[model samples]
Target: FVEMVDNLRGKSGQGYYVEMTVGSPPQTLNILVDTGSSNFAVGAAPHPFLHRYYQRQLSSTYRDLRKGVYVPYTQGKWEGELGTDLVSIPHGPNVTVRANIAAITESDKFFINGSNWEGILGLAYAEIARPDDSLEPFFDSLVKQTHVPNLFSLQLCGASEVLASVGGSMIIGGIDHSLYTGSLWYTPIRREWYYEVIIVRVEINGQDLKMDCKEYNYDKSIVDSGTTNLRLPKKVFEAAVKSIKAASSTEKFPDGFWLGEQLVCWQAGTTPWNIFPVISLYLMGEVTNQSFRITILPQQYLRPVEDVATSQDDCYKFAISQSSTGTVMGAVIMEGFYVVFDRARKRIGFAVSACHVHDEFRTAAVEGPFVTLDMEDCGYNIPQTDESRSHHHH
Candidate 1:
């Protein structure tokens, strides 16, 4: 039983090959699948984002060839020098590919807060080094040059949170029909590799919630496996929450049901309103499809008015996210699914699969429904660290 979230615009992923110098010269180091950007770089010496298996030198494999390459991200950036060398990987012998010797710049953000990664393979078509006419990344170039369809596919496991991919044949080509169901929701590609969607209306249990895609800054939402949650503007969030509250038969909180900082129950007078409503996401698919049943969080778990309200100012915070509040569709909906990014077709497909145990929150979700609709990022060092938060919003 798979539900597909379709998109019309094409999507693409770049596979990166890294090189390093072991006891010999630089050889094939590693092949990494980049999400949005591509910079075929190698693991440098003891740098800030140094990984355990990084080797700066190799006898016969590596030469001091410095082909400088830099890749910019949403926040932290990746910069590295290019080395025409071969490095070893676990699969087989060291397969050498034209790769860049790279390192992460000294910045606040790395791939993760604590851990160190060699570098990310730029996957998004927009993040190419040179956009003139040549395909910079070897993957795209391989396809264009060799005419062999070079594509990357991700089969994720909900129980394991592990993603598997088959090079060459698995990607570049079309996807299998057995993997998914429902028609695709097509949209045009506005930016490089990224597509924007016009959400015409959102319905819950056959009712329209009255969300105007035109009124809001309908700048297409990003479909990224690299992210964790579905982020939307405060206005959109409020609309979704309102609809969800209207449907569910959950218990309501008492008057003045907000005191504890950790917990909050919705109250009528002191607070705004709390009602459990059935939720649906109506996207502009390939055709006119009805409401799509996205998971709905019961209203019982909603935070009390006071918890989200500004205690000092006596108001509610419009934005709950740390940064800008645009809709971020993350692994939550993407979990237990193999999301297909069809660049040539400009369509996004979601195939129900399994996730790994690495993510406890998602794994637990299948076991039971989500307790609350609004959740804070407790996994990493977010802008609003739990400890750094004040009791009242100033």
Candidate 2:
């Protein structure tokens, strides 16, 4: 089994094919780095349709290493043991990250429903497993243990070169020319990398959006490398969608709506709405414009799964959907911005100018609250986050 060293870090891969060094031969696998979920894993044993795709791609890192891996699921469907191997990141050099290689079992269904994911590298900040021989979450351990500034930055290019990295290279030692033009804000890792924000207020263009902490509790968010879409709590999502739809003639799906839900969006193209300037996420006074530049043209509406599925069936829905609304700042929206998370300072900062690849992203002032109401607000019964019902100690 693999072990956790207190020095390993993770990076989000820009493309599916990431450069890596396998055992001796130094093979490269098309790995995905997910921040939303902890765990760096690749497809072990491929399913019918999955195996063929890998074969055609001729991925040098692709291997049926399932025999040595073991992963256990809470749903009780899949379980795996642990395996250790060296992971090389593309940024600077290779980091000997201690990871768990998951091997699917006979009764497991991870491969059946197209869920046979290229294994996951657990980068969560908590004591995930026994922490015996594991990568003690390079970033987390470094920030807390070493006192190495507790800060790191990521410039993920959506349409440009995004590197996949593990270990040493991925764990940046200092800032470089690839960063944005601003002071990096550091936020503490309250619950690992996920922390609660003392959200002062959300302002659009210097005006308050009327959103208060009383109505919207502080969020528990994780800056994930593995996730591709941007997630928002239900209240935020509803407010955003309404703003976007108000500018266009498209119809809203009534039945699929849920309150306090999380919406993860991947901007493929420019929608008719030009909704990028409408919504803004205010965190600790720093505002981030969550509007995504469309990947496709105006006709590409309803292209994403969230845009078509019911709220209950949505893939991006997080704990926010069950109780208090939660939002995810996915890789898609994070692209073209220099994001810095500083645990030592307990702040998160971003700069749009550092994004060397996509020039489409521009740092602008937060948009104030404008009433873009739906024709008929289909308000549904939402579950509230009661302190007693949840595991909250306070």
Candidate 3:
């Protein structure tokens, strides 16, 4: 299993990173554990506090591919050159695995100012990998070449007040039962590019939004770990915000708020849970012959960040925003539970975390009770139609 340490920066923890060694002599660096995209790239320069970089001169097993690459995101972008190196993850004994690398030539200002992460290690399918779509992810290779299983679970500690207390765990080969409670709910992977699931229903303020199951593209909702906040379609976000405002003593700006146009904030002491209702996402378990409900508590969506002008705590708005296309279930909603991406079975599992029960660690888990997804009633027939068959392999 691979242990992930919290890269604490800014007001809240930005991301989680794992230690990895590169080159023949072994130069270590903390790479961000990302599931939004698949491609590994190192920083071109040292960060403000975390001074880590890939020194080509010191590595005996480094090769420059002489190809330029640029990875773009909604917030920023990373530019670099395609390269190859002997990448190693320290298991019981250090094991060397060769994978494609993008040694960053340039990056956005966030790399130096805001973000503490020095590199990015993607864990999604190779189909959406940047730099080269054909390039395979490092974790996929570890499973094929080494003793590591084709499974990995993420236990990201929830938001915390102390940086030191905000750490989480990433199990590579198996699940840590102690981290979670109850049986795991497994759902078939509808696509490879993202961890897309079928959402049977969406309830806001304990009331169903009346979303048509047939119209809701199951593949549109992506369970992305790399993204920081939940993103929904324009109409859905509007409906959510309307429900939240109606349930609480809050008013809309009509104009826009800090996070997005549909969000509003209240006084610091106003308890959101006392007024607002819980949001529930009912998911379709096509394989397990069972359905699961993932609920979002009122406080989970309300965040308290320092006001830009006053620099004091007085903001509490929905932890979700509007997206142009598909919905993104990001870290804000993800931190509340234990998530497992089962590559072996081509499914995703989730269970309420013990950490959330105790209110202990905000970002990491070292151990917990063991639980497995019961496959006894698992059987979902796939339609032989062209549209369904086209996405079956995806």
Candidate 4:
């Protein structure tokens, strides 16, 4: 039986969030969905950025787990107490998960300004959970309880308002063929902790960065919807900037554009897509010595800040960033594809998403029958457990 189905609301350039019911009498809250980590923590305190919080005293079903949990990121973090409560989604999967919910007592810049989301839902494996993998993620608990498939799919359509149309949707237990075009291409899930993948090439307008194949996966490479930009490490990022600059010899983009320091605005009613180059990511495929390419056009990378700025000029910001950590295929990249986390088969699938912003605010493009060289998509650092070992090899 299908255990989950729900629509997601996207905060432009931020992350995508879904509605969930928590506590007794079912208090609905918008929770940000993150594939980079594991933990279901919500605001317990009244924070300015977060409109509402989980009032522990109000929920008759709440029970304190007596342990403390803290989650830290590159910029934001939160501290909370581990606990359990009755949880359910707004849409179907009309079942309750006696899930672990962390009540955040303190945080720093976690709930950013102008954010409609009040809590963060970590959708990855339990290995990266706050306390440890022993606590099993909410999704894990849901599947165990309902006896559903050990898989979930996501399509982040951004913030689109088209009259009851599909803005975005999260599908659990199976794939929604209607939500995507063509076949869902599969890539080996390198590691179990993160929905990790291999990156053989990062190109600007078809020209490769030409770095050591291993360098791209230095720390790690993952597909994370909770992130905002397509983040890369120092070397790979600089190489990409160089490639893009060279690709656009006639257009001298400001250094601020690359560093995310300032915005570049063009006259209103003018187009900026012609000036930028397309970015492509080649991932290791399921077949031996083969890979697939996922390409995002200028409209996807040259993100418009708004339709018209204060001065009537269209302001745009570079969506790629240099991260101290490893590479991450964040919203900037995922928005172009409907991604599937097939933990049962140890493969991640990507297809052209319905929200793929290719045309007038459209889908990312994909190509197969490419090639692969010597490399392990997943790094050797991850400690394999019995479960992880079984997940691979079908």
Top candidate on TM-score is 4
Give the alpha carbon lDDT tens digit for every residue of 75-97 in model 3.
77888887788887553124678
**In model 2, how large is the Cα lDDT of residue 388?**
27
lDDT, residue 141, model 1 = 45
Superposed Cα RMSD, model 2: 11.1
lDDT against the true structure, each candidate: 0.38, 0.38, 0.65, 0.79
Residue 352, model 1: Cα distance from true site in angstroms: 3.6
Question: For each candidate, C-alpha RMSD in Å?
Answer: 13.9, 11.1, 6.4, 4.8
Q: Is candidate 2 or 3 superior in TM-score?
A: 3
lDDT of 4 by residue, 135-165 (tens): 7789998998897689989887743121112
Write candidate 1's Cα lDDT for 118-207 as tens digits: 444454563344321132554454345444434444443221121223121123334545543443233333345433443444555558
Q: TM-scores of all models?
A: 0.54, 0.56, 0.79, 0.90
Worst 10 residues of 3 by lDDT: 359-368
Over the stretch 172-200, how does candidate 2's per-residue lDDT look in tens digits? 44444444554434333334434334333
For all candidates, the clash counts are 67, 61, 13, 6
After superposition, the stretches of candidate 4 with alpha carbons farther than 4 Å from their true spots are: 1-6, 159-166, 307-311, 360-363, 373-394
